[PDB]
Amino acid sequence: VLSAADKTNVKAAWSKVGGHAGEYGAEALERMFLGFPTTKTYFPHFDLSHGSAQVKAHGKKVGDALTLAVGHLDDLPGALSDLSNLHAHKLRVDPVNFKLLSHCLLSTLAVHLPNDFTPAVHASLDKFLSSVSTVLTSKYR
Amino acid sequence: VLSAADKTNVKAAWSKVGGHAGEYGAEALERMFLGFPTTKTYFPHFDLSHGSAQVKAHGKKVGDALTLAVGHLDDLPGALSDLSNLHAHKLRVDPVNFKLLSHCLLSTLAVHLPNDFTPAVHASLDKFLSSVSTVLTSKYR
Amino acid sequence: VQLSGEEKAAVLALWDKVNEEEVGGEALGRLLVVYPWTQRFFDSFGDLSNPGAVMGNPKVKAHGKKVLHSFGEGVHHLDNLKGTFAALSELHCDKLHVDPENFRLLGNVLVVVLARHFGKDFTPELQASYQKVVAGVANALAHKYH
Amino acid sequence: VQLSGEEKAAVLALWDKVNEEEVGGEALGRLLVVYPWTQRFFDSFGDLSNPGAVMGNPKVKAHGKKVLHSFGEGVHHLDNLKGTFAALSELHCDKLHVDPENFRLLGNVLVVVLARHFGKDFTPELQASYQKVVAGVANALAHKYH
Numbered sequence: 262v263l264s265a266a267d268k269t270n271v272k273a274a275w276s277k278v279g280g281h282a283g284e285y286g287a288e289a290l291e292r293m294f295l296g297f298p299t300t301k302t303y304f305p306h307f308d309l310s311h312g313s314a315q316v317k318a319h320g321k322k323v324g325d326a327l328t329l330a331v332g333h334l335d336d337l338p339g340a341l342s343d344l345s346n347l348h349a350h351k352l353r354v355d356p357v358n359f360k361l362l363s364h365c366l367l368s369t370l371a372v373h374l375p376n377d378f379t380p381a382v383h384a385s386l387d388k389f390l391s392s393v394s395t396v397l398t399s400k401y402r
Numbered sequence: 403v404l405s406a407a408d409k410t411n412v413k414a415a416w417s418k419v420g421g422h423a424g425e426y427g428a429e430a431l432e433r434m435f436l437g438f439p440t441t442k443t444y445f446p447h448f449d450l451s452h453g454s455a456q457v458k459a460h461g462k463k464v465g466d467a468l469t470l471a472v473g474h475l476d477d478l479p480g481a482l483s484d485l486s487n488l489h490a491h492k493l494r495v496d497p498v499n500f501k502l503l504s505h506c507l508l509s510t511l512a513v514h515l516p517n518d519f520t521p522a523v524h525a526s527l528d529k530f531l532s533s534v535s536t537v538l539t540s541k542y543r
Numbered sequence: 544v545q546l547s548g549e550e551k552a553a554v555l556a557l558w559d560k561v562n563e564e565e566v567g568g569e570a571l572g573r574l575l576v577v578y579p580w581t582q583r584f585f586d587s588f589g590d591l592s593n594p595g596a597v598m599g600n601p602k603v604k605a606h607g608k609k610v611l612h613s614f615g616e617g618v619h620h621l622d623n624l625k626g627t628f629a630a631l632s633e634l635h636c637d638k639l640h641v642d643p644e645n646f647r648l649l650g651n652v653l654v655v656v657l658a659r660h661f662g663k664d665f666t667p668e669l670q671a672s673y674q675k676v677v678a679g680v681a682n683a684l685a686h687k688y689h
Numbered sequence: 690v691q692l693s694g695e696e697k698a699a700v701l702a703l704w705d706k707v708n709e710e711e712v713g714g715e716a717l718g719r720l721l722v723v724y725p726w727t728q729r730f731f732d733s734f735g736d737l738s739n740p741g742a743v744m745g746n747p748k749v750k751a752h753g754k755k756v757l758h759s760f761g762e763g764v765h766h767l768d769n770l771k772g773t774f775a776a777l778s779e780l781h782c783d784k785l786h787v788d789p790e791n792f793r794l795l796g797n798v799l800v801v802v803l804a805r806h807f808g809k810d811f812t813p814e815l816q817a818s819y820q821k822v823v824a825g826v827a828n829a830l831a832h833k834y835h
């Protein structure tokens with residue numbers, strides 16, 4: 262459900278993120294673990310302390326996956342097909358948790374790119390994120 | 403996000419509905435107008451009385467659209483592109499109302515096909531309905 | 544959240560014919576099948592691989608019955624929902640950490656089931672009553688959250 | 690829904706530096722743009738065609754300021770949220786017929802905005818405080834619903 266100009270907005274917005282994707286996914290995660298504690302449930306084996314090298318580590322995992330989807334918007338089901346199986350078949354994550362991480366991710370970007378985070382870029386990124394949230398939670402097997 | 407066996411379930415489930423689609427959309431509507439009054443808002447020009455020939459009339463409109471989408475699951479964005487513009491661009495219906503009509507629609511089917519409404523058919527129809535709810539509320543223009 | 548005098552009389556009048564053991568066991572199974580992510584809270588129940596394993600599972604039939612019994616305790620004390628569910632609230636919130644949107648779901652499935660069972664007697668008007676007498680239970684359960 | 694003694698001190702300490710007229714005007718505009726179906730409740734405001742028409746609209750800057758003022762009246766009376774929003778509740782529920790999921794939205798956008806404005810001083814810990822001091826206002830507003 263991504264329009265033509267949503268795509269352009271996305272591709273361009275993510276180029277401004279550049280190489281901090283990793284950094285951002287790590288901070289976006291930390292914000293979620295403090296604001297929505299119900300999520301520390303899917304991470305019992307992790308060290309959720311503030312300077313956790315495990316979170317920084319996972320954050321990277323997350324940021325990279327996104328940059329991956331940005332380069333394949335015309336077929337997100339084809340490029341995330343494995344992450345979809347992990348989060349929907351194996352982990353069985355509640356889809357409501359996806360709206361939360363997306364929200365915390367958007368809160369991070371506002372803090373770091375206050376001048377590029379224009380209302381129009383906000384509308385596109387929110388939709389792009391929703392597409393990704395839909396794919397990852399669909400058991401099409 | 404419709405799997406392979408969800409499609410088959412749907413096509414087959416809707417063949418059992420047969421020619422009562424019209425009838426059902428009418429009753430599914432009536433159930434919504436009584437259980438979720440907040441919806442009489444999008445219908446100020448209608449006669450919402452119990453035997454309303456306006457609702458029976460619209461019901462048909464709705465049932466037919468569905469049978470239409472059942473025959474084009476492999477491209478719902480292509481076949482409902484006009485209904486998507488009417489409900490998202492012109493009417494600006496709140497998406498939460500879609501979960502309600504879908505729920506009332508599923509309640510109708512249980513009442514009329516208690517033996518075909520197997521749990522597996524329930525899971526597929528719910529997803530099929532959600533796909534349709536997503537399309538109709540997406541402004542890809 | 545009182546419905547009305549005439550309504551209420553019809554609401555309790557249906558619950559008399561409600562067969563606990565079956566109504567509740569199909570409602571839980573229906574939830575585990577349709578919204579498969581809730582399966583995560585019941586791993587100790589065993590095999591939930593497919594809809595056949597789930598419907599025939601004993602723990603599910605058992606637990607389903609208790610949840611249904613809990614609703615009844617609500618269908619009666621409609622006036623004190625926030626004190627009748629005071630403890631359960633504490634269990635599902637700070638202990639289990641369940642999201643409140645699920646209380647919603649189970650509520651509607653409980654209804655889709657009551658429809659399949661009572662057929663044409665489950666009139667749109669009656670369904671309307673139950674729709675609130677369900678939403679109230681869903682809210683009481685989320686109260687002692689914060 | 691009290692946060693804590695140390696937390697709270699920091700929450701009111703930020704609201705002092707909050708610039709009403711701008712913070713609230715960008716929060717409403719952001720909402721009309723991101724979730725375009727809410728535009729439906731403000732047709733009398735005029736042209737909302739695109740993000741440029743909306744941000745520069747006077748009625749939106751005006752109304753946005755009042756909504757922001759209303760939050761402040763909550764950021765202070767954290768102890769009496771259900772009596773401080775008693776009337777507003779009645780306006781948004783039975784009068785306007787607004788869905789409660791929207792109270793949610795505006796709440797988070799208000800936060801995404803506070804982030805863009807205060808940068809690195811809006812620490813994840815502070816954001817956590819605001820996340821509840823926002824959720825409480827969202828709930829008070831839905832109380833006098835039924």
Ligand code: HEM
Pocket residue numbers: 300303304322323326327344348352354358359362393
């Ligand atoms: C945009 C959203 C998300 C993306 C891009 C994403 C991406 C990823 C990636 C790349 C991995 C696997 C990396 C590997 O193979 O080592 C992963 C693992 C995981 N994700 Fe997600 N995820 C997302 C949201 C979530 C949400 C909402 C939750 C739940 C709160 C979640 C819970 C997990 C868990 C528990 C793991 C496994 C950790 C482990 O055992 O090592 N993810 N995710």
Ligand code: HEM
Pocket residue numbers: 441444445463464467468485489493495499500503534
């Ligand atoms: C599966 C869901 C839905 C389908 C299949 C659907 C289908 C339709 C169709 C076919 C029409 C236009 C027919 C024509 O051109 O005369 C229509 C009109 C309309 N729909 Fe829906 N609709 C759906 C859900 C909803 C919902 C959730 C609402 C809001 C509660 C809604 C509100 C309206 C309104 C107000 C009209 C215009 C009535 C008029 O002025 O004649 N629809 N819908």
Ligand code: HEM
Pocket residue numbers: 581584585609610613614631635639641642645646647649650680681684
């Ligand atoms: C909203 C309606 C619900 C009601 C009325 C309800 C009621 C109950 C009741 C009566 C118990 C038994 C307490 C006891 O035996 O001491 C219970 C336990 C529990 N509930 Fe719920 N529940 C509801 C929804 C949920 C949902 C949606 C989840 C799923 C995430 C959930 C997960 C659990 C779990 C895992 C237990 C523990 C069972 C055990 O080990 O004994 N409940 N619930």
Ligand code: HEM
Pocket residue numbers: 727730731755756759760777781785787788791792793795796826827830
């Ligand atoms: C949840 C947070 C919200 C708060 C704190 C809030 C607060 C207010 C306040 C303070 C007023 C002014 C009352 C007066 O001037 O007497 C108002 C009016 C109104 N609100 Fe909200 N509101 C919220 C969300 C919403 C949402 C999401 C909608 C959108 C559907 C909405 C639609 C309206 C409308 C249309 C008016 C009438 C404005 C006028 O003509 O004066 N509100 N709100």
